[PDB]
Design a protein around this ligand. Structure first.
Ligand SMILES: NC(=O)c1ccc[n+]([C@@H]2O[C@H](COP(=O)([O-])OP(=O)(O)OC[C@H]3O[C@@H](n4cnc5c(N)ncnc54)[C@H](OP(=O)(O)O)[C@@H]3O)[C@@H](O)[C@H]2O)c1
Ligand SMILES: NC(=O)c1ccc[n+]([C@@H]2O[C@H](COP(=O)([O-])OP(=O)(O)OC[C@H]3O[C@@H](n4cnc5c(N)ncnc54)[C@H](OP(=O)(O)O)[C@@H]3O)[C@@H](O)[C@H]2O)c1
Ligand SMILES: COc1ccc(Cn2cnc3cc4c(cc32)CCCC4)cc1C
Ligand SMILES: COc1ccc(Cn2cnc3cc4c(cc32)CCCC4)cc1C
Lengths: 255, 254
């Protein structure tokens, strides 16, 4: 058990209900130095207010759009020279056009397919590459995924293929970065009412099903993901890599 | 935290047992520990091994999982001596060595059923009885091996018993979920224990892991203990029916 003198980069807080914010609250209580990245200016405004944290220099805010190689390379170069070398990265970034989830999968356009792949899956590969440069003693990289990457889930469509890609990405990164003592894992979170759940019709229906069918008979929240994230980002998960942990009330395990 | 938590640890034979790695960790976390044993020889080891911080504790109970009476009576005594419990670490397995040496199609009925009985059904009765001592919920964790998911050479009847145990974990998870009891499995990589010391060419497979696994090294007992600490605590709050591999990433390759 450490975290006291350790440094973590959290990527993908948009508002107060972001999964990544749940992660931040947990790691902050354990006393970690946190570094944040954001894409939208609106997310920067939210980050500054959300620094209801115990973090001393409420700085460490970097603009990084993972579509640009330039921004991720420059972004992580800037982190290293401002903060020093890090101990881990939490990846909480995904995107698909809403029209592709409404929405007949066989109708998915090439550009719509590649966009989701680019931001939801490849982003991990490039972030891991840049993050490695700042982990000379090793570390831990965690990505957020969903059950739709393993099974065909209604409406999830193109994001499901992006998640499947991301999960395999985790495994191939684990094999490659293992010799450097960098562990790569995933969290498969259950459904949570977040900014990304906006636009998705019948979202209450799927939360209703979890409540009624999952072993625990209740939905999960951001901080539960955060506690498993803390387990994965620390030396408590020392012998664990290439793994996908379901924080979903056991829903993965049923019919 | 864990200072006001009590865990039952089943399956310590000696210093190298995976379950002693678990105890080691939980004890450092300030937990009160209850141990179960089958052999009198294992009880003597337990008393030496208690280089823990469990002060005038020595919570030791003889439980042979083959006996319904011994497990029911065992947990009734635990409940009487400690009150309520917060979790169980299950680390018991057995099979006749003849079945591993050893063509799988030649497995006898007695061998098959004995390995199922001790390695798999044991979790079911323990869970039922341990539930009686978990009014507000808790966490049960079982040790499994990758041989349960894939056909591993010479693992044979134990692989079938591990596959049975993995499903057992999932069905208990669905069953005990509403009682606020989580149940999970740890899939440990190969470790030099008393049981493994019975399998020929065990050094060969440890050499294989060291060369093939992502982390390019073997795991030890305390590493399984750390993940167990995670699974037994409220840090794994929404995690149940899961199988976590502590095996240097060997599960994820070729
Ligand atoms: N919500 C759920 O039910 C659920 C369930 C399982 C898994 N997940 C996964 O959890 C992760 C977090 O999502 P969330 O639910 O917390 O919703 P969210 O707060 O909207 O998170 C998505 C984040 O990704 C960022 N992002 C999108 N495109 C980007 C780009 N090109 N460059 C950099 N950042 C970009 C967004 O930043 P901007 O808004 O600033 O663009 C946003 O902060 C996602 O990977 C999602 O797939 C969610
Ligand atoms: N070693 C490995 O490479 C490895 C890898 C992955 C998983 N595992 C699993 O981890 C678990 C722990 O085994 P280990 O490797 O630590 O070997 P171990 O030290 O020999 O532990 C085996 C324990 O099972 C107990 N046991 C056997 N039959 C029993 C019965 N009928 N009733 C009650 N207890 C009984 C033994 O108790 P007595 O000595 O008192 O009879 C012993 O304490 C096993 O489930 C094994 O399948 C081991
Ligand atoms: C019923 O199926 C679902 C179950 C959960 C979700 C929530 N969700 C999980 N990962 C997501 C990624 C994105 C969105 C929603 C997401 C929105 C656009 C950006 C990427 C969505 C559907 C469709
Ligand atoms: C790659 O093959 C292997 C890898 C690990 C092992 C060690 N091992 C794991 N679970 C076990 C259960 C038992 C034994 C050995 C066991 C012996 C006594 C009965 C219970 C064995 C083989 C064969």
């Amino acid at each position: 058990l450490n975290l006291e003198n350790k440094t973590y980069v959290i990527m993908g807080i948009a508002n107060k209900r972001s999964i990544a914010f749940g992660v931040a609250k947990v790691l902050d209580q354990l006393g970690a130095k946190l570094v944040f990245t954001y894409r939208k200016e609106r997310s920067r405004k939210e980050l500054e207010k959300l620094l209801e944290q115990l973090n001393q220099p409420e700085a460490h805010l970097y603009q990084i759009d993972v579509q640009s190689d330039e921004e991720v390379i420059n972004g992580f170069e800037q982190i290293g020279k401002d903060v020093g070398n890090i101990d881990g990265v939490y990846h909480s970034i995904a995107f698909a056009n809403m029209e592709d989830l409404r929405g007949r999968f066989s109708e998915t356009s090439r550009e719509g397919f590649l966009l989701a792949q680019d931001i939801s899956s490849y982003s991990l590969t490039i972030v891991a590459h840049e993050a490695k440069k700042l982990m000379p003693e090793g570390g831990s990289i965690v990505a957020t995924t969903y059950l739709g990457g393993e099974f065909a889930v209604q409406n999830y469509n193109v994001m499901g293929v992006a998640k499947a890609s991301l999960e395999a990405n985790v495994k191939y990164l684990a094999l490659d970065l293992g010799p450097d003592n960098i562990r790569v894992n995933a969290i498969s979170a259950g459904p949570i009412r977040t900014l990304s759940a906006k636009g998705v019709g019948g979202f209450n229906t799927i939360l209703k099903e979890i409540e009624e069918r999952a072993p625990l008979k209740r939905n999960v929240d951001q901080v539960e993901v955060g506690k498993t994230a803390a387990y994965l980002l620390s030396d408590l998960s020392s012998g664990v890599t290439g793994e996908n942990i379901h924080v979903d009330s056991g829903f993965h395990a049923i019919k």
